[PDB]
Ligand binder design. Structure first.
Ligand code: HEM
Ligand code: HEM
Ligand SMILES: CNCc1cc(OCc2ccc3ccc(N)nc3c2)ccc1Cl
Ligand SMILES: CNCc1cc(OCc2ccc3ccc(N)nc3c2)ccc1Cl
Ligand SMILES: CNCc1cc(OCc2ccc3ccc(N)nc3c2)ccc1Cl
Ligand SMILES: C[C@H](O)[C@H](O)[C@H]1CNc2nc(N)[nH]c(=O)c2N1
Ligand SMILES: C[C@H](O)[C@H](O)[C@H]1CNc2nc(N)[nH]c(=O)c2N1
Ligand SMILES: [Zn+2]
Lengths: 413, 408
C-alpha cells in the first residue's frame, strides 16, 4: 500500500490526499483482480484474539484525548489486559463507550450524514437484563430522539456478547416500521419489505390490524432468551401525512410515513467487543422515503398511481413518466415534513454537506472512507456534488457491521 | 472460486466463473476499494500476450489446438523474432475489436457488441488518409439517422515515436471559448482543445455550437487540421413536446457519439487511434452534457422558463428541470428519426445482456458506478443489480492527451 492515495473531484478539480487508509483493519472483498464495490454484503473472540484488538482501541482512544503514552494510558492497558486474562473479556469505561459509538458512525463509509457524527447522544443500557427493560430503554430513546419533531441523533447500547448464547437482540430491522401482509391472491398490503418479520410477530401472538400503515410491535431478546413482544406507545410514534404543495389530489393517496429512522439490526464493534443490540437513529434524507420506500417496485410501488393522477402518457418509457412522477413524490415528502416541522434533509443539501465534511476529514484526519455506490442518492445522481467526487472505501474500527437475522440463528428454549 | 451476484429486486442470482480468466489489475486491494476512481512492449512480453489472444480466438471458432491454431502461433512467434512485433489477420482484428467492446465494463450498451462494423485502416500513412477514413466512418455510421455501430482502426504503435492519434476526444464536438469576462461560450470541456485548433490556424466562428475541426496525427508527425464536410454532420434541434418556449433556448446536439481518444489493445498490440461510435443514451446529452456544472450548465435557464421557485434546494427545482430537459432530448431525436435510447430501455437491455453473458460466457464484467444512469438511478433495474468488475483483454484503455506528450 502506497503512503499517499489521491482522490479527485472532476467538477471542481480539487485534489485530496488520503493517508488514513493505512489504518485499514479488515478486508473489503475486493482484490487486485476484482472489485466488489457493488456487492451489498461481501462463536466469540478468544483471549489471544481479543488482546491486540483491545490495545488497538485503547491506544486510539488515548491518542484522541492527547494522553498517548501517559500513566493513565499504560494503567488502562494493564487493567484491560488483566481483565481479559482472568475473565476472557473486558468492560469499556463510559468515556470509551461514547468515543467508540461516535467513531463507528464517523467510520460508516455508507453514511452521507456523517457531518453530524460528533453530535450523538449515547445511552448506556449495559445494565439491562430483561426484554421489558429493553422496552423501557427503547421508549426513552424514541422519545428523546423524536423531540417533538426537532430530531436528535442517538444510540442505545445493550450488553455486549459473552459466549454467543446470551445475545441481546432487537429482532426488528428498525424500531419503527410498517407491517406487510401477503394476501391469498398474491397481492401485498402494507410494506412488502416487512412481510417475513410481520409473519413472525403474528406467530408470537401479535394481533394485526391488517392496514396499510400498521406500526409493528417491538420484538426484543434479552440475554439469549426467547424474544418478547411489546407495543410502542402510539404517542411516541411521530408520523407525517404526505401532501403536495400544488397537487391537491396527492393527499387523497392516503400516504404517510414515520419521522424517526432508527436502525436496530446492526452490530457495533468496539475494541473487539461486540454489541449485538445497539439501535441508533438520526433523521431522514427525503429520497429514502420518496424514492426507495415509495417507488421501489418491491416496496410501496406508487409510481403508476401517481403518474395516472398526473395524467402522464404511460405508454412509452421515453416519455419519462416515471422520472416525472418520482420528482413530484419527493417534492411532496420534503414539503410535508417541513410543513409539520419534522427534521428532514433534501439530497442536494445533504450531499453538499457531506462534501464539506469529507474535505474537513481529509484535512484533520488524513482521510474519509466513503462508499460511492451508497453515498450517491438514488435520484438525480450527477446533479449532486458527490457524483463527481472520487472516493476511497476501506474499513476502520470501531464500526457498524451487518449480522444475520436472529430468527435464523436463535435456539428456541 | 465461483462468485455469486444477486439482483435485490428480482432475487435472481447469477454465478460468475469468467472473472477467473482476468489477468489485468482493477486498482483495488484487499484493504482498499477504488471502484469510484476514474483512472486508477518487448518480444518477451509480447508473445505470451499474443498467444493468450490467438488461443482465445481459436477457441472461439472451436478450432483450439488445431493445425491452423498451431501454425498461427509459430507464424506469430517467428514474426515477433524477426520484426519485434506482429500483424493480426483481418479475422483476428474484427474478433478483437468486438471483444474489446464486449469486455468494456463501463458500457451499458453491450447487448449490441457483436454488431460492429470494423474498418481496417492499418494501411494508412498520412493525416489526409486518416481524414478520408474518418469521413467514410462518419457517413456509414450516421446512415441518415439510422445509426450503425462502427470502429475504424489505424496502424498499431511501433516504437512509440510514430503514433497515430486523433487529437479530438470525439469525432464530432462543439468548441468552447474563454470570454474576457471570465465566462465560457460553448462547451467548457473543449476549451483547451479549441485553443490548440485556433493556434494551429483554425478560424473560429465563436458560436455556442461550432463543430470542431479534426486534428489528426499520423506516424508521430505534427497533427493537421481538417473540416468535416457539413453534410456529414447530422444535428438535432432540441424542442419540447409541451413547452413551446423550449426551442427558443436555441439548443441542439449532434447525432453521432464517436469516441476517438481511447486506446484499443489486442494481443499485446496497441492501437492508439481507433475512433468508434454507436448511438446515444438520452442522459448522456440531457443530464451530463447540458446539466453538469462544468458543461453547458443550463438548469438555471430552464427552471426560470418553467417559473420554478429556485430559492430553496428542497423545492427540487433542479430535479424538475432536469427531467423536462431529458424529455426534450428524447422527443427531439425521435421526431427526427435519429437513433437514441432512453435510460429505462437501455438498462433493461443491459440486464438481459448480463443474463445472456452469464449463460453463454460464465459472466459479464460490469462497473456499477458507470452503468447506473446519472438520473433516476433506483427506478432503473441496474441500480439493484450486483455487479462484479474485472478487466478482460482485448480492451479499450485510457491514454494521455497527445498534447502532453508530443514534441513538435
Ligand atoms: C443525522 C442524520 C443522518 C442522515 C441524514 C443519514 C443518512 C444516511 C443515508 C441516506 C444512508 C443510506 C440509507 C439507505 O439507503 O439504506 C445512511 C446509511 C448509514 N448510516 Fe447514516 N444518517 C444519519 C445518521 C446516522 C447515525 C446517527 C448513524 C449511527 C450512529 C448512522 C449510521 C449509518 C450506517 C452504519 C449506514 C450504512 C447502513 C448499511 O450499510 O446498511 N447514520 N445514512
Ligand atoms: C450502440 C450503442 C451504444 C450505447 C447506447 C452505449 C452506451 C454507453 C454509455 C451511456 C456509456 C457511458 C458514457 C459516459 O458516461 O461518458 C458508455 C461507455 C462506454 N462505451 Fe458504450 N455505447 C454504445 C456503443 C459502444 C461501442 C460501439 C463501443 C466500442 C466499440 C462502446 C464502448 C464503450 C466504452 C469503452 C465505454 C467506457 C468509456 C470510458 O471508460 O471512459 N460503446 N457506453
Ligand atoms: C434494508 N437495507 C439494508 C440495510 C440498511 C440499513 O441501514 C440503512 C440506514 C441506516 C442508518 C440510517 C440513519 C439515518 C437515516 N436517515 N437513514 C439510515 C438508513 C441497515 C441494515 C440493512 Cl440490512
Ligand atoms: C519472441 N518469441 C520468443 C518466445 C517464444 C515462445 O514460444 C513460441 C511458441 C511457438 C509455437 C507454440 C505452439 C504452441 C504453444 N503452446 N506454444 C508455442 C510457443 C515463448 C516465449 C518467447 Cl519470449
Ligand atoms: C469524459 N468522460 C470520461 C471519458 C469517457 C469516454 O467515453 C464515453 C463513451 C464511450 C463510448 C460511447 C459509445 C456510445 C455512446 N452513446 N456513448 C459513449 C460514451 C472516453 C474518454 C473519457 Cl476520459
Ligand atoms: C467520481 C466518479 O467516478 C465519476 O464522477 C464518474 C461517476 N460515474 C460515471 N458514470 C458514467 N456513465 N460516466 C461518468 O463520467 C461517470 N463519472
Ligand atoms: C446492487 C447495489 O449494490 C444495491 O442496489 C445498492 C445500490 N446503492 C444503494 N445505496 C443506498 N444508499 N442504499 C441502498 O440500498 C443501495 N442499494
Ligand atoms: Zn473495489
Amino acid at each position: 500500500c502506497p503512503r499517499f492515495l489521491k482522490v479527485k473531484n472532476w467538477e471542481t478539480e480539487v485534489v485530496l490526499t488520503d493517508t488514513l487508509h493505512l489504518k485499514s483493519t479488515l478486508e473489503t472483498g475486493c482484490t487486485e483482480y476484482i472489485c466488489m464495490g457493488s456487492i451489498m454484503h461481501p462463536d466469540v473472540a478468544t483471549k489471544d484474539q481479543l488482546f491486540p484488538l483491545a490495545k488497538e482501541f485503547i491506544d486510539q482512544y488515548y491518542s484522541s484525548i492527547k494522553r498517548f503514552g501517559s500513566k493513565a494510558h499504560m494503567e488502562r492497558l494493564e487493567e484491560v489486559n488483566k481483565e481479559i486474562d482472568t475473565t476472557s473479556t473486558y468492560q469499556l469505561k463510559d468515556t470509551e463507550l461514547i468515543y467508540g459509538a461516535k467513531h463507528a458512525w464517523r467510520n460508516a463509509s455508507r453514511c452521507v450524514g456523517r457531518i453530524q457524527w460528533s453530535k450523538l447522544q449515547v445511552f448506556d443500557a449495559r445494565d439491562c437484563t430483561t426484554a421489558h427493560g429493553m422496552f423501557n430503554y427503547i421508549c426513552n430513546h424514541v422519545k428523546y430522539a423524536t423531540n417533538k419533531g426537532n430530531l436528535r441523533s442517538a444510540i442505545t447500547i445493550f450488553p455486549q456478547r459473552t459466549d454467543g448464547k446470551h445475545d441481546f437482540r432487537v429482532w426488528n430491522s428498525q424500531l419503527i416500521r410498517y407491517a406487510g401482509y401477503k394476501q391469498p391472491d398474491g397481492s401485498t398490503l402494507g410494506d412488502p419489505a416487512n412481510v417475513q418479520f410481520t409473519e413472525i410477530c403474528i406467530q408470537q401472538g401479535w394481533k394485526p390490524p391488517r392496514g396499510r400503515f400498521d406500526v409493528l410491535p417491538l420484538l426484543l431478546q434479552a440475554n439469549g432468551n426467547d424474544p418478547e413482544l411489546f407495543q410502542i406507545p402510539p404517542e411516541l410514534v411521530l408520523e407525517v401525512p404526505i401532501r403536495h404543495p400544488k397537487f391537491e389530489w396527492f393527499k387523497d393517496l392516503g400516504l404517510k410515513w414515520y419521522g424517526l429512522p432508527a436502525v436496530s439490526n446492526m452490530l457495533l464493534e468496539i475494541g473487539g467487543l461486540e454489541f449485538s443490540a445497539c439501535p441508533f437513529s438520526g433523521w431522514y434524507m427525503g429520497t429514502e422515503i420518496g424514492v426507495r420506500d415509495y417507488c421501489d417496485n418491491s416496496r410501496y410501488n406508487i409510481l403508476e398511481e401517481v403518474a395516472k393522477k398526473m395524467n402522464l402518457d404511460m405508454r412509452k418509457t421515453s416519455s419519462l413518466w416515471k422520472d416525472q412522477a418520482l420528482v413530484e413524490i419527493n417534492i411532496a415528502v420534503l414539503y410535508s415534513f417541513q410543513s409539520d416541522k419534522v427534521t428532514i434533509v433534501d439530497h442536494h443539501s445533504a450531499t453538499e454537506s457531506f462534501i464539506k465534511h469529507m474535505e474537513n476529514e481529509y484535512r484533520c484526519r488524513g482521510g474519509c472512507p466513503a462508499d460511492w455506490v451508497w453515498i450517491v442518492p438514488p435520484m438525480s445522481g450527477s446533479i449532486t456534488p458527490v457524483f463527481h467526487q472520487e472516493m476511497l472505501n476501506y474499513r476502520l474500527t470501531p464500526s457498524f457491521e451487518y449480522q444475520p437475522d436472529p430468527w435464523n440463528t436463535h435456539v428456541w428454549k
